[PDB]
Design a protein around this ligand. Structure first.
Ligand SMILES: [Cl-]
Ligand SMILES: [Cl-]
Ligand SMILES: [Cl-]
Ligand SMILES: [Cl-]
Ligand SMILES: [Cl-]
Ligand SMILES: [Cl-]
Ligand SMILES: [Mg+2]
Ligand SMILES: [Mg+2]
Ligand SMILES: [Mg+2]
Lengths: 460, 460, 460
C-alpha cells in the first residue's frame, strides 16, 4: 500500500494567516471590543533606511512603467531575509509599516534575560546581512510589560501593542545611527550584562550594542535550544523544516471568520483568486490622512482602550462615507495613530482631495470630544505612493511607502492640535481658499522641502 | 554531466484527467454512441451527511460574503481525505454528486471476494477519519456485474454505470444510519464471511459491518500487495509516490480531444488559464431541472442505452435553446436522472425561470414518446445553490450542492409522471397562473417545508 | 535552531531571464548602440519539421476551439525535451524562431575541437528522442568565428549573431534530410575526425554524421567533465540540480532594467501577473511583414552593424505609427531579416492590412537609401497564425508559427528588391487595385499554392 507524497495545501485560511502574527492566529480571545491582554516580552523594531527615497526614483522614466514591480521585488528580497531571521530565532512579526517591522518574543518574566540574548544575536545577524542600494538597517530593542488591545466592529478587527516597552522600542530605533542596534534602558537593565558589550549613547540612557562576549563554556545552539522550551509555537519535530507553525493551519470556518476580519477586502479578493496578483503592487496617486490621538497616559491600556474603540467606531463610519480606509494603526507620536488612505484599490474616486479634507475635519471634531482624548492632530498629504504586499511569502502585509506618507506623519507631529495639509492637497481640492490658512514653515525630521503647508481651518 | 530535477509538468491533459475516472482516461473505446461495456467489480458509495444544511448557513451574514469560499474549503478539506483513502486502497473514483461520491474497484470475477475485503477495510478507515461540523459519513457497498454506457454527440460525452450492483449500492447507502458501512445482499453473499463480522438490518437482507476479524496469520499489507496484481493502474515503482497514474499522462492531442468532451466549457476555460480560479466557486441563484426517465428494466444496458442516447440528443438541443446545462447524469429514482441547471457561469440570463419551465415541458413531451421510456418525471426548484469544484487536487469535479437540488430530486420522485415546480419558480416565472395547478403537499424524505408545490400543466 | 526549507523564488528577474540566453543575461556590456562583440564557438540549429502543417490542422473543427492550447502543449512537450538536452550538454539557447531554435557553445579557439564532439553527441541524443506526430528533427552544426550585434534604442534592445559560421549553420540545416545531423565544412575541418564517422553530401562540402566511433579508453562522462572547465555557467556544486544558473539570479534593478528591454510589453505584463496566462497562446489573424536587408558582406559586423541600427531606428518608428511589432530579427536570406507582425496582443486594429502595406512601403523607401544596404525585399502575408510561448519553463520565447509566416519569408526571398503581398492582403486592403501588380507565379521552397501574388507598387 502506497504512502504517497502529501502536497502542501495552501488553503485560504493559511493564506489569511500570512497576514497576521501568532499573537492573533493562535490567540483565541473574546470577540468583545475593546479587548485587552497583558504579558511580558522583548520587542524588536527593524527599519530599512532609504526605501522611502528609492520610491520616488522608481517613478522615473528609467523604470519604463515597471517601477512598482521593481520596487516590490527589491524590497521584498531584502525584507524576506530579515523576516526569515526573525522567525528562525523564534520571533513573532507583529506588523509591517512601510519599510519597517515590529517583532515580539513573548515570554514569562523569568525568561526575559535569556531571550534578550537571543534577540540581540538575531539583531547582529540581521545587521550582518547588509554590507551591500543606498540602504541601512537600524534596530531598536526593548523589553518589559506589554499590553495588547483589540478593537473593531462586527466585521473588522485591529490590534495594537501599548506600554512603556512599546514607546521605548520606537525611541531606541530613532536614535540608531545608520547600522546600530540600540537597547532601551530597561532592556539593558534586564539583559545578561556579563555577555553584552555596549557603548553609551549621548544624553541617553539607551545603549548601543558593540558585540556579544560569550563565556568559556557557552554554546549558542545549546542555549537557543533551552530557550525554545519557552516558545509555544516554535516549529519542531516533523515540522522543523517550516518557518511558521501557521503554515500547518487547517480549515476551520469559525477561526477563518475571526481572522479574516483583520484583513482588507481587496486582499481577501486576491487570496480568493478573484483578482490578478499583479494589481496590488502599484505606485498610485493617493491622499494620506494621518490621525494622531494623544492621551494623558499612553501606556495605560485600560484607560486608553475604550477611547480608541470609540474613536475607531466614528473613524470607520466617516471613512466609509468619504471613501477612505484604515491602513494601519499603531502607537506613534506620543499617542495612537491611524494611517488612513484615500484612493486605495476600488476607491479611486473623483474629488478625493476634498473628501480627505472633510473627513479629516469630521474626525478632528468628533475625536476632540472623546473625553480621555487630550489632543487630536491630523496631517493630510497627497502624491504618488507605493501600495503593496511587503514581507515574506509566510509573513507579509499590505502597506504604503512614500515621501508623502512620511510628510503626513511629520505634519501631524510638528503641527499638533490642528488639521494640516500639503500644497498638492490644497491646490487640488474643491474648497475655497479662505477655508485654509498658510502656516509658518517648520524644519521637520526627514523632510527636504514640502512647498507651503496649510491648516484646514474649515467653513468657520 | 548533470541529472537535474524534472519539475512536475501539469499539462492541460493532466488537468483534464483530474475530472475523469481511470475507466474513461485509460478506456480507449469507440467514439460511436451509445457505447456499452460490461465488467464486474465492487462499488462504494460515500455520502457526507450535513453539507446540504451547511450550505444554507454559509449564505448568512456571519460569512461576510465569503461563504462560497469557506464552504468549498471546508468541504474539500474533508472530501480530499476520503479521496486519498479510496485512491491509496486502489479504487477509481467514478463521479462526485454534491457531497457524495461513487468509487469502483474493477476486477475479474475470481478476485471479487478478496477485493471486497480491501474495500471494507478502506470503508472502516474512512468511517474512522471523522469523529469531529454536524457531519457524518455513510457508506454503502455492492459487488457484481456492472455495465457502462457512454453517450453523447460529436462534441460532448457522458458516461454512467448501470445494473443491479449500481441500484444496490445506492439502496445500501440510503439505509446507513449515521456512521454505518452497509453491504448489499450480493456483496455479503460474495465476501469472505469468515473475516467479516456483521449485524443484520431490519426488513432488509443488506447487512451492517461491525468489524473485521482477521485470522491468525493474516497481514493486511501482504494481502493488499497480492490484490495489487489485479489493479491495472495502481501507482508503482518509480511512481509509487503518486496518488494516480493519470498524473503521469503525456500530451497526446487525440486523447485530449476525446477526454475534453466530458468536461464543461467553463471548466476548460479555467484549465486553460483564461479565467481567474476564484470564479467557479460560487453561491449563485439558479434553477435546477431534475429529469427522471423510468424504463421497464433499469439494469439492462442494451435496452436502455439507445433510449438514453435518444433522450440525451433531444435534451441537449432544448437546453441549448433555453440556456441550461447538464451537470450530471446517473442512475437514481428507479431510472436515469439528468441534473440540469439554469444559470451556471456564462448562462445567467433574464427569464431563466420561464425558460426552465418551457424546457422542462418540452423535454417531458419528447421523452414521453421515446418508446422504451415508461414514465418521465421532472422536478424544478429555484434558489441559492453552491456551484463549484469538489474533491482532491488529483481527482475533482464541478458539482452543485443545495437544499433546492435535493428538493428538485424529491419532487421528481414523489410526484412521478408530471412536471412539478416550487413556489420560487412559480412566483417568479412570466407564465399565467392557470398554466399551473397547486398540488397536495406530500411529506418528503429530507425536506422541511417547501411552501406550496405546483404542477406545470402548460398551455393546455 | 531550525534550518528550514528555502522555497524557490521565482522573482520577476528570473522570469525575465527565461526569455534570454546567458550571452545576454551574464553579458554586462555597454548600453551604447550598435554594440559588437567577437568570439568563437559551435552553433547548433535544430528544426522540427511539420509543425507548420499541424498549425493549419489545429484550426479545424475537431479541436473544438482549443486548437491553440493543444498546439502549444504538444509543441512544448517536444521542444522542452530538446531544450533540456541542449542545456544538460552545456549549450546556451540563443533564440527560438517558430519550431526551430539556435544554440551556442562559446569557447576559446583551442577548445573547439573537443566541444564539437560534445555537441555532436548532444545532436545524436536529440535525433534519438523522436522515433514517434508527422514530425522530424533536422540539425545543422557549424563552428568558428562568431560576432554578436546588439542594437536598439533607449527602451528596446535586440541582438543577433553574424558571420560565416552563422550562415553555415543555416545552410547545413537546410540540407538535412528528414533526420540528419549535418556538419558545415569548417566544422568538419575542426572536428576530431578520428572519432566522427561521416558520409559526404552531393555537390556539397558539408557532411552528414553517421556515428561516433570512440577510441578504446574513451569515456564520455569523463570527457564531458573536462570540457565543463571551459563552460563559464555550467550549473555545479550546490546548483548541479538546476538546468540554468539563471534560475539563481537575484533581484537587481539595474540588471532587470537592462534585461527587460529585450522582452515585449505583453510578455512583461504576463510576467508581472497583470494578465491571465491563457491569453498569450492564440491562433489569431495577423499580417506578417518579413523584411530583408541585403549587404555587400553579410559576415562583417563592423560594416553591417551601423546599418542595421539605422534601419532599426526607422523601422521601429513606422511600426509604432502603423501599429506593428518586431517579433524577431536574425540573419537569414543572405542578409538581416526582421519578422514583423500586425495584430499581436493589444494591436488588433481595423485597417490592419492597409497599414501593413503602407508600413512596408515606407520601410522599403527608407531602407533602400541606407547606403550600405544593397537591396531591400519585403514579403507581406495574412492569415491565421499561432502566436505564443515556445520552449521550456527555464528557457522559452514568444514566437509565431504558420503557413503565412513561411509564405512571407519565401516571397521576400523569391521576389527580391520589391514589396510583395498575398491574395488575402491584396483583397482585404483598402487600397485601389492599380496600386498593385499581379506577378508571375514562382515555384517556392515549401509552399503548396498561394493564390495569386502581387507586388505593392504604391501610389506611383
Ligand atoms: Cl502595534
Ligand atoms: Cl494595524
Ligand atoms: Cl454513474
Ligand atoms: Cl455525469
Ligand atoms: Cl540570432
Ligand atoms: Cl530577435
Ligand atoms: Mg522607514
Ligand atoms: Mg448528500
Ligand atoms: Mg521550421
Amino acid at each position: 500500500m502506497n504512502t504517497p507524497k502529501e502536497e502542501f495545501q495552501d488553503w485560504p485560511i493559511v493564506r489569511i494567516a500570512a497576514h497576521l502574527p501568532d499573537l492573533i492566529v493562535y490567540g483565541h480571545f473574546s470577540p468583545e471590543r475593546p479587548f485587552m491582554d497583558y504579558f511580558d516580552g522583548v520587542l524588536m523594531f527593524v527599519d530599512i533606511s532609504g526605501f522611502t527615497a528609492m520610491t520616488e526614483k522608481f517613478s522615473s522614466a528609467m523604470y519604463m512603467d515597471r517601477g512598482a514591480e521593481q520596487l516590490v521585488e527589491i524590497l521584498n528580497y531584502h525584507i524576506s531575509a530579515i523576516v526569515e531571521k526573525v522567525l528562525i530565532f523564534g520571533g513573532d512579526i507583529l506588523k509591517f509599516a512601510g519599510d519597517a517591522l515590529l517583532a515580539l518574543w513573548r515570554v514569562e518574566r523569568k525568561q526575559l534575560k535569556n531571550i534578550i540574548t537571543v534577540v540581540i544575536k538575531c539583531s547582529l545577524e540581521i545587521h550582518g546581512l547588509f554590507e551591500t542600494l543606498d540602504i541601512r538597517v537600524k534596530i531598536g530593542l526593548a523589553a518589559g510589560h506589554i499590553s495588547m488591545l483589540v478593537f473593531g466592529d462586527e466585521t473588522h478587527s485591529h490590534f495594537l501593542v501599548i506600554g512603556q516597552a512599546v514607546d521605548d522600542v520606537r525611541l531606541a530605533q530613532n536614535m540608531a545611527q545608520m547600522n546600530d542596534v540600540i537597547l532601551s534602558p530597561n532592556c539593558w537593565q534586564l539583559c545578561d550584562r556579563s555577555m553584552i558589550e555596549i557603548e553609551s549613547v549621548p544624553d541617553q540612557r539607551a545603549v548601543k550594542v558593540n558585540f556579544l562576549k560569550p563565556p568559556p563554556n557557552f554554546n549558542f545552539d545549546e542555549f537557543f535550544t533551552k530557550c525554545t522550551t519557552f516558545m509555544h509555537y516554535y516549529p519542531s519535530g516533523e515540522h522543523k523544516n517550516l518557518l511558521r507553525l501557521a503554515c500547518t493551519l487547517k480549515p476551520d470556518p469559525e477561526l477563518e471568520m475571526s481572522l479574516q476580519k483583520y484583513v482588507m477586502e481587496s486582499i481577501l479578493k486576491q487570496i480568493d483568486n478573484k483578482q490578478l496578483q499583479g494589481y496590488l503592487s502599484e505606485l498610485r496617486p493617493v491622499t494620506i490622512v494621518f490621525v494622531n490621538l494623544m492621551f494623558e497616559d499612553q501606556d495605560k491600556a485600560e484607560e486608553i482602550g475604550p477611547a480608541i474603540q470609540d474613536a475607531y467606531m466614528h473613524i470607520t463610519s466617516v471613512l466609509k462615507i468619504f471613501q477612505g480606509q484604515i491602513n494601519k494603526v499603531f502607537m506613534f507620536d506620543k499617542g495612537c495613530s491611524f494611517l488612513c488612505v484615500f484612493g486605495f484599490p476600488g476607491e479611486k474616486v473623483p474629488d478625493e482631495l476634498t473628501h480627505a479634507l472633510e473627513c479629516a475635519m469630521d474626525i478632528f471634531d468628533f475625536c476632540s470630544q472623546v473625553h480621555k482624548i487630550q489632543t487630536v492632530s491630523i496631517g493630510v498629504a497627497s502624491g504618488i505612493v507605493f501600495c503593496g504586499i511587503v514581507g515574506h511569502t509566510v509573513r507579509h502585509e499590505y502597506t504604503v511607502i512614500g515621501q508623502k506618507v512620511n510628510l503626513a506623519a511629520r505634519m501631524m507631529m510638528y503641527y499638533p492640535g490642528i488639521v494640516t495639509c500639503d500644497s498638492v492637497t490644497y491646490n487640488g481640492s474643491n474648497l475655497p481658499a479662505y477655508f485654509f490658512k498658510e502656516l509658518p514653515k517648520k524644519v521637520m525630521k526627514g523632510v527636504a522641502d514640502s512647498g507651503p503647508l496649510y491648516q484646514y481651518w474649515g467653513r468657520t
